[PDB]
Paper text:
The ycn operon comprises genes encoding three proteins: the putative copper importer YcnJ, the copper-dependent transcriptional repressor YcnK, and the uncharacterized Domain of Unknown Function 1775 (DUF1775) containing [name]. The B. subtilis [name] protein contains a predicted signal sequence N-terminal to the DUF1775 domain, suggesting that endogenously, the DUF1775 domain is localized extracellularly and tethered to the membrane by the C-terminal transmembrane helix. We crystallized both the apo and copper-bound forms of the protein and determined their structures to a resolution of 2.05 and 2.11 Å, respectively. Overall, BsYcnIΔC adopts a cupredoxin fold featuring the characteristic Greek key β barrel shared among many bacterial copper-binding proteins.
Author numbering: 27 to 155
The structure:
């Protein structure tokens, strides 16, 4: 399950987020794509050995960040944490973190479901007062 923490954060602020990506298969995780939640503006990423990081704007105005393994990826029995900075929206909202976990066999696990789904996205509660 991919998580982006903190699970609560203040509206309007520049938050340092940490995405944790555990292995869930006995195969390497070679790439992770994270969609920015609505109204959350990506600012910067923290470099990490063994990964190249890039951002993608899209035809719809959403933005994604991609971490691609340049070494062995995340192996069985491992997890990795990836840190970045984003600006929170101005109003209270539930920010969903749609993540796509790529494995070496070409499979993609889509951490995009709601509460009851098999692969839910994690959420940050953007609050105020």
């Amino acid at each position: 399950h991919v998580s982006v923490k903190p699970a609560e954060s203040a509206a309007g602020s520049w938050e340092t987020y940490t995405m944790k990506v555990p292995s869930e298969k006995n195969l390497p995780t070679t790439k992770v794509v994270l969609k920015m939640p609505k109204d959350v503006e990506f600012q910067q990423y923290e470099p990490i050995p063994g990964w190249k990081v890039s951002t993608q704007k899209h035809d719809d105005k959403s933005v994604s960040v991609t971490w691609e393994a340049t070494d062995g990826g995340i192996q069985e029995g491992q997890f990795q944490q990836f840190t970045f900075v984003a600006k929170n929206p101005d109003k209270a909202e539930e920010a969903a973190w749609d993540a796509y976990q790529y494995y070496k066999d070409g499979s993609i696990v889509e951490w995009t479901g709601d509460e009851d789904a098999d692969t839910p996205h994690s959420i940050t509660n953007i609050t105020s007062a």
